[PDB]
Amino acid sequence: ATIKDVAKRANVSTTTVSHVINKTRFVAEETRNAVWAAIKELHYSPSAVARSLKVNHTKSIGLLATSSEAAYFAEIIEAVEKNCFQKGYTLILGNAWNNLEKQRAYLSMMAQKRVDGLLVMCSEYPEPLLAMLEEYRHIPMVVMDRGEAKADFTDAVIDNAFEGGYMAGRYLIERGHREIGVIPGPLERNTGAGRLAGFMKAMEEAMIKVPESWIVQGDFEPESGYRAMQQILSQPHRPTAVFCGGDIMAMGALCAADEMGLRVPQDVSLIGYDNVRNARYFTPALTTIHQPKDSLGETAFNMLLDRIVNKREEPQSIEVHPRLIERRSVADGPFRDYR
Amino acid sequence: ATIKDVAKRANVSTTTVSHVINKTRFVAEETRNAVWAAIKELHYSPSAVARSLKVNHTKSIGLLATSSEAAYFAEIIEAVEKNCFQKGYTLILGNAWNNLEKQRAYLSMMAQKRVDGLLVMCSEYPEPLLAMLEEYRHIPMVVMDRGEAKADFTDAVIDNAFEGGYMAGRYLIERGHREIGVIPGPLERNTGAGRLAGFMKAMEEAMIKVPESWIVQGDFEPESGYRAMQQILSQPHRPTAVFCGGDIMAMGALCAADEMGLRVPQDVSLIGYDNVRNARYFTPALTTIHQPKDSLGETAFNMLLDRIVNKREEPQSIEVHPRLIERRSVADGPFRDYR
DNA sequence: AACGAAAACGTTTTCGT
DNA sequence: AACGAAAACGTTTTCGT
Ligand code: HPA
Ligand code: HPA
């Protein structure tokens, strides 16, 4: 149970056991053996809390999430966790559900648990969270889902959501569309307002006016896609193409369409965003803007592990790049030939 | 940084600080105050590794998963994590991907981290994993995804996958079907062979022979649904209804159908399984057997927290119940009127 | 009454022999 | 050369004053 019971059992010191265990200093084979053997019978497991107490690090990462069911997220997390395992780190997942208090509760639980660093995916960053985040300015952390830098006490990865919004609108335009609608995720999120403006840029360049009857708020969830679609597709005057700010919501956009009779992309075209793992299987296969999610995760881990190991101190920010992925949900629009 | 710097700062003992911090014994207000105040300026955070070292428990749960992207799973995990937070527990997620070694690596990392208990979702349990699981027979754990009890050193929750398979076939039968096909998940999994046999029971009762050209192995992933469907729907002689052992795979079953021209449920009917969170949004809305997933998670946590707290020792097993959920992907079959 | 002294948890590492 | 003695990490708790 203890390094003692083991040392004793092996007729050696604990200092010796600790040396064989951690291969920290030369040790006679027979000794080594003897130690292992005792470790076996004893059925010993080194307490990492004991060693952590001494060594000052826990070899563990704290993930202050929002939620982990949402495909998007689920995908990043599984990414993060993989780089944790690759590099010995243990992962502690905290879905704060956009709840300040819960955020408070996790950040603390984390700090007490003394995580080597913090990976931040809160979606929304109002001042009180920004505020709270700074107390923990001491523990090394990277905020993986924001716009710019409202930080200076942090590491960040930027997703270029604007340039994705815009990639989306452009394609719709390059396909013949001009009566386009949009359902954005929450405007308090980067992946919300960010994508939206990207897209909106595109329209103004195209001089395409976007009627408010055609912009309906989503929340990244299926029911919001459904409701939003249904709302745009039920205008007396409806668009020819829709930009849905998140695939999952998009999926719920397809559901409405079909249920309302309209064919996609024959009746309406739909371009989504994220390129979730199973969008290729949406019906019809979803055309969307893809987010390098695996790389969003690893670039975060790796960006954090650095501050930790190399004890780096100057705030960093690495960009990642969204790319269009043409599937089967967008059809040429009316202006395709006039260009 | 330390209880010392704090105690000092407050002009009190550490024993006193520890008492105010943990509300463990009466303490003069002014003292209390003084302590907090020092805790504030000091910007103090109690090390839970220190306290864990002393108190003998980490107030943390180890989740030996398989994967966490898969909706099914993703859903349970988010469940587990919620009950962890409800009850103070910290969660450590370990996706072992059905990799023994990785399993070895996580189980150890976990034990060393000294988790208060283990939540087990490995999907597949070959002997070498069963074997490995027993060494850890000392730490309190519940295996949440298996058939019966190949355990005796554990707590378990059973999902009645058989009775779900069978619920599925029955409905298909009660709808007029007799040329039915099936795509099961991996036969080394409960949710695989279990559901399958449930369903197969149903057929034998109905005297419905199920042609092997109609049973195609899935792996719970979209591409397997797709491929499996495509394979069944391309028989010179095809079925009228299909039972797809997992919703995600089902989703890929719809994709093939559509892409092959066939309408669902007009051309083929499809009943899935799991009732993932967004199946209501599949197109068309997926008819499926639902797994109480949130309750599968909580019943697991709660079942574990017991062995921990109440230090219970006699192996338990609590059943959970799958229920049919009629959506819009199944249509009456040819025998509907003759019954 | 209200609080402290110091032993203790399970290890790592620095002197040493 | 090969290994041990004992200080130390940051707390909790049991005697005590
Ligand atoms: O906040 C989000 N939630 C879910 N999916 C998403 N894709 C981009 N942003 C999000
Ligand atoms: O192993 C599984 N994986 C994914 N979804 C599932 N639904 C039941 N079993 C499974």
Length of chain B: 339
Ligand 2 centroid from CA B158, angstroms = 14
CA-based nearest residue in chain B for residue A56? B49
Q: In this complex, which of B45, B109, B226 lies closest to A281 when CB atoms are compared?
A: B226
Q: How many CB atoms lie within 10 A of CB A316?
A: 13
Rounded CA separation A3/A50 (Å): 10
In DSSP terms, which residues pair with A64 in a beta bridge?
A: A94, A120
Ligand 1 centroid from CA A219, angstroms = 8
Residue having the nearest C-alpha atom to atom 1 of ligand 2: B123
Task: Identify whether residues A230 and A277 lie together within a single domain.
Answer: yes
Task: Identify whether residues B202 and B333 lie together within a single domain.
Answer: yes
- Name the method of structure determination: X-ray
Put simply, whether A138 touches B (Cβ < 8 Å) is yes
B240 lines ligand 2 (CB under 6 A): no
Q: What SS3 class is residue A141?
A: strand
What is the dihedral sign for C-alpha B3, B4, B9, B13?
A: positive
**Rounded (5°) CA angle B195-A254-A258:** 90
Task: Identify whether residues B43 and B91 lie together within a single domain.
Answer: no
Task: Identify whether residues B174 and B254 lie together within a single domain.
Answer: yes
Residues 6+ apart with CB under 8 A from B149: B156, B315, B317
Task: Identify whether residues A232 and A91 lie together within a single domain.
Answer: no
Q: Which nucleotide is nearest to A10 (CA to C1')?
A: D3
Residue B47 φ then ψ, to 5°? -80, 125
Task: Identify whether residues B182 and B331 lie together within a single domain.
Answer: yes
Q: Which of A230, A272, A265 has its CA nearest to residue A336?
A: A265
Task: Identify whether residues B275 and B166 lie together within a single domain.
Answer: yes
Task: Identify whether residues B121 and B41 lie together within a single domain.
Answer: no
- B306 to chain A, closest Cα gap in Å: 22
Residue at which a domain ends, from A43, A58, A73: A58
- CB proximity B48–strand D (7 Å threshold): no
Rounded CA separation B318/B306 (Å): 13
Put simply, whether A139 touches B (Cβ < 8 Å) is no
Q: Which nucleotide is nearest to A51 (CA to C1')?
A: C11
Single-letter residue type at A338? Y
Element (H, E) at B242: strand B241-244
B287 lines ligand 2 (CB under 6 A): no
| Nearest ligand to the CA atom of B276 | 2
Residues 6+ apart with CB under 8 A from B262: B233, B268
Tokens linked to B104? 């070895």
Put simply, whether B97 touches A (Cβ < 8 Å) is no
**Do the Cβ atoms of A71 and B71 come within 8 Å?**
yes
In DSSP terms, which residues pair with B29 in a beta bridge?
A: none
B129 lines ligand 2 (CB under 6 A): no
Residue B173: domain span: 161-290+323-339
Residue having the nearest C-alpha atom to atom 2 of ligand 1: A220
Element (H, E) at B25: none
Rounded CA separation A122/A66 (Å): 5
Rounded CA separation A29/B61 (Å): 37
Which residue places its CA closest to the C1' of nucleotide C14? A15
Rounded CA separation A2/A325 (Å): 56
Task: Identify whether residues A300 and A330 lie together within a single domain.
Answer: no
For chain A, the domain total comes to 3
CB A66 within 8 A of CB A97: yes
Q: Which nucleotide is nearest to A18 (CA to C1')?
A: C12
Residue having the nearest C-alpha atom to atom 2 of ligand 2: B220
Rounded CA separation B162/B321 (Å): 11
The arrangement of strands across the sheet holding A287-290 comes to A180-183, A241-244, A269-274, A287-290, A323-325
Rounded CA separation A94/B19 (Å): 29
End-to-end CA distance of chain B: 77
Residue at which a domain ends, from B43, B58, B73: B58
Rounded CA separation A24/A35 (Å): 14
Task: Identify whether residues B131 and B279 lie together within a single domain.
Answer: no
Is A240 annotated to bind ligand? no
- Quickly list DSSP for A219-268: -SSHHHHHHHHHHHTTSSS--SEEEESSHHHHHHHHHHHHHTT--TTTT-
- CB proximity B235–strand D (7 Å threshold): no
Test site for ligand 2: of B77, B97, B123, most ligand atoms within 8 A of the Cβ: B123
Mutate to test the interface with B, among A39, A56, A72, A78 (most CBs of B within 10 A): A78
Residues 57-86 (A) with a CB less than 8 A from some CB of B = 58, 60, 67-69, 71, 74-75, 77-78, 81-82, 85
- Distances, alpha carbon A177 to alpha carbons A99, A202, A245, A278, A338, in Å: 40, 12, 17, 26, 11
Task: Identify whether residues B283 and B192 lie together within a single domain.
Answer: yes
Query: For position B24, which CATH number holds?
Result: 1.10.260.40
Residues 106-135 (A) with a CB less than 8 A from some CB of B = 106, 108-114, 135
Put simply, whether A218 touches B (Cβ < 8 Å) is no
Q: How far is the CA of A164 from the C1' of C8 (A)?
A: 59
Put simply, whether B262 touches A (Cβ < 8 Å) is no
Q: Which of B100, B140, B94, B85 has its CA nearest to residue B118?
A: B140
Helices A195-205 & A162-174, crossing angle to 10 degrees? Answer: 40
Residues 6+ apart with CB under 8 A from B243: B165, B168, B169, B172, B180, B181, B182, B183, B199, B270, B271, B273
Residue B104 φ then ψ, to 5°? -60, -50
Tokens linked to A190? 């980067």
Q: Which of A229, A249, A247 has its CA nearest to residue A239?
A: A229
Q: Which of A320, A229, A322, A224 has its CA nearest to residue A273?
A: A322
Query: For position A301, which CATH number holds?
Result: 3.40.50.2300
Rounded CA separation B40/B233 (Å): 68
Put simply, whether B246 touches A (Cβ < 8 Å) is no
Contacts of B21 in chain A (CB under 8 A): none
What residue ranges in A96-204 does DSSP mark as E strands? Answer: 117-120, 141-143, 155-158, 180-183
The arrangement of strands across the sheet holding B117-120 comes to A317-319, A155-158, A141-143, A117-120, A60-65, A90-95, B90-95, B60-65, B117-120, B141-143, B155-158, B317-319
**Do the Cβ atoms of B69 and A75 come within 8 Å?**
yes
Element (H, E) at A108: helix A100-112
Torsion of CA A287, A291, A292, A293, to 10 degrees: -110
Only one residue has tokens 């190991």, namely A309
B274 lines ligand 2 (CB under 6 A): yes
Q: What SS3 class is residue B9?
A: helix
Contacts of B61 in chain A (CB under 8 A): none
Task: Identify whether residues B182 and B278 lie together within a single domain.
Answer: yes
